[PDB]
């Protein structure tokens, strides 16, 4: 019996959603994403693992008057993409990078309806920016920056205490990607990782350090 979907306010117009899946031999692992409010409209930054929790997430905001305008998935893994099928089935616009959709397609998974590429992509102009630091955790990992709040959603790229699942990781590239991310967003007030607690800009340095260490021992 998995823990309940959790939704709580982080800052003005920004909620953290947490969903849980059993994965071996980790036990139960929490996964954090965001919901970002733009007036009376809501954007999902990552989806929960399941249709059911995606539905609960969507319904929570819909029942409070917010129309769901879209979701963005930060990488191809199920902890960021598990709700894309559901959201597509409800005609809610989904977004992923062109590299993320290619990895989904290749793995037999339903793709985001919209895609983008490049270093920077504005999902919402001046409000929600998507940045591609380069390969790290996965080949396609992106991050999401909220310039008005100085909040960076780092997803599974930000790994301040250890790199985590290396299966699809580019250990050779991660230091350079982590270096670029740090230099881009050292101004961040809050950095929100996927599987640990919210922190400040130091998580960027800690991630770089973890990436460097991981490269050296391989
Ligand atoms: Zn992942
Ligand atoms: Zn993850």
UniProtKB/Swiss-Prot annotation:
Its cofactor is Zn(2+). GO terms for biological process: antibiotic catabolic process; response to antibiotic. InterPro entries: Beta-lactamase_class-B_CS, Metallo-B-lactamas, NDM-1-like, RibonucZ/Hydroxyglut_hydro. Keywords: Antibiotic resistance, Hydrolase, Metal-binding, Periplasm, Signal, Zinc. One of its GO terms (molecular function) is zinc ion binding. It is found in: Periplasm. GO terms for cellular component: periplasmic space. Binds 2 Zn(2+) ions per subunit. It catalyses: a beta-lactam + H2O = a substituted beta-amino acid. Inhibited by captopril stereoisomers, Hg(2+), Fe(2+), Cu(2+), chelating agents such as EDTA, dansyl derivatives, including dansyl-C4SH, bisthiazolidines, mercaptoacetic acid and by PMPC phosphonates. Inhibited by 3-(3-mercaptopropionylsulfanyl)-propionic acid pentafluorophenyl ester, via a covalent binding to Lys-159. Not susceptible to inactivation by the beta-lactamase-blocking agents clavulanic acid or cloxacillin. Coiled coil: none annotated. Zn(2+) 1 binds at residues 75, 77, 137. Zn(2+) 2 binds at residues 79, 156, 195. Transmembrane segments: none annotated. Pfam families: Lactamase_B. Monomer. This is Metallo-beta-lactamase IMP-1. It comes from Serratia marcescens. The lineage of its organism: Bacteria, Pseudomonadati, Pseudomonadota, Gammaproteobacteria, Enterobacterales.
């Amino acid at each position: 019996s998995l823990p309940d979907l959790k939704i709580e306010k982080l800052d003005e117009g920004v909620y953290v959603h947490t969903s849980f899946e059993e994965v071996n031999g980790w036990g139960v692992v929490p996964k954090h994403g965001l919901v970002v409010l733009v007036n009376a409209e809501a954007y999902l930054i990552d989806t929960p693992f399941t249709a059911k929790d995606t539905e609960k997430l969507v319904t929570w905001f819909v029942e409070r008057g917010y129309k769901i305008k879209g979701s963005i998935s930060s990488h191809f893994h199920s902890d960021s993409t598990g709700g894309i099928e559901w959201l597509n089935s409800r005609s809610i616009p989904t977004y992923a990078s062109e590299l993320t959709n290619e990895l989904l397609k290749k793995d037999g998974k339903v793709q985001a309806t919209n895609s983008f590429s490049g270093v920077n992509y504005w999902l919402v102009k001046n409000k929600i920016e998507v940045f591609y630091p380069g390969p790290g955790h996965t080949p396609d990992n992106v991050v999401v920056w909220l310039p008005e709040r100085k909040i960076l959603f780092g997803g599974c790229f930000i790994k301040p205490y250890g790199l985590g699942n290396l299966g699809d990781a580019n250990i050779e590239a991660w230091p350079k990607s982590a270096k670029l991310l740090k230099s881009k967003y050292g101004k961040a007030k809050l950095v929100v990782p996927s599987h640990s607690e919210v922190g400040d800009a130091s998580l960027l340095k800690l991630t770089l350090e973890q990436a460097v260490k991981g490269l050296n021992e391989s």
